[PDB]
Homo-oligomer: A and B are copies of this chain.
């Protein structure tokens, strides 16, 4: 509920990308990073800073400016100086700053075309420690990290790749809030069995099995609902 429905409403507006668009944006991000290097390496302003500022300047026109989980303004003190130097730059270094602003706007477009992916994934990690809103924030951070790890030259879909990162971030967050208590052996046994079964089904399907498929290998006695619930106290909580 709350603005969460607002968020979902707003992002539901961003269009989807084609492998071609995903990859062109990706390439612009790398070229952008590449440029920022030149800037820092001629201004001594340190790469991370230059980017935070360039990024901020783009959040201005950003179709979605307040994305949960992501740190915003690079601190009104540093931005209010680091942007001072970038402004007054010889003609030559003026283009490197252009490729930077253009690559960071690209990075924003990519992140935006996948905010729905993050929400969808987060709905799959519901009721396991964090609130829907909290999950979305962790997930979005994973998305950002994926954009930083993606390799456009491989020319293979970004969403699937990002999915792993979006999930690893969420998986890490819910695994943080835990205490070690006592559980009866038979429970420890079936958790370990749900885990092996799911991993085994994966080696056969070339993808993670569904709760209904895990229940097949387990059943009778086990159905989709039961496996998912029991899997809530597992080291590997979710399947796909």
- Number of A residues near B (Cβ < 8 Å) is 40
* A206 and B164 form a contact (CB under 8 A): no
Determine chain A's interface SS by DSSP, over half rule. helix
A155–B174 Cα distance when bound, in Å, is 13
Set B163, B195, B205: member contacting A206, Cβ < 8 A: B163
Could you say which residues of chain B place their CB within 8 Å of the CB of A163? Answer: 206-207
A115–B118 Cα distance when bound, in Å, is 30
Could you say which residues of chain B place their CB within 8 Å of the CB of A18? Answer: 192, 195-196, 199
Set B116, B171, B195, B207: member contacting A203, Cβ < 8 A: B116
* A114 and B203 form a contact (CB under 8 A): yes
* B161 and A164 form a contact (CB under 8 A): yes
A123–B203 Cα distance when bound, in Å, is 12
Once A16-B199, A16-B200, A20-B235 are accepted as A-B contacts, the answer to whether A206 and B168 lie under 8 Å apart by CB is: no
A172 contacts partner chain B, Cβ-Cβ < 8 Å: yes
A117 contacts partner chain B, Cβ-Cβ < 8 Å: yes
User: Could you list which residues of chain A lie within 8 angstroms of chain B, going by C-beta atoms?
Assistant: 16-20, 114, 116-117, 120-121, 123-124, 154-157, 159-161, 163-164, 167-168, 171-172, 192, 195-196, 199-200, 202-208, 235-236, 240
Which 10 A-B pairs give the minimum distances between C-beta atoms?
A: A156-B168, A121-B206, A120-B206, A116-B203, A207-B240, A117-B203, A16-B199, A154-B168, A161-B164, A124-B206
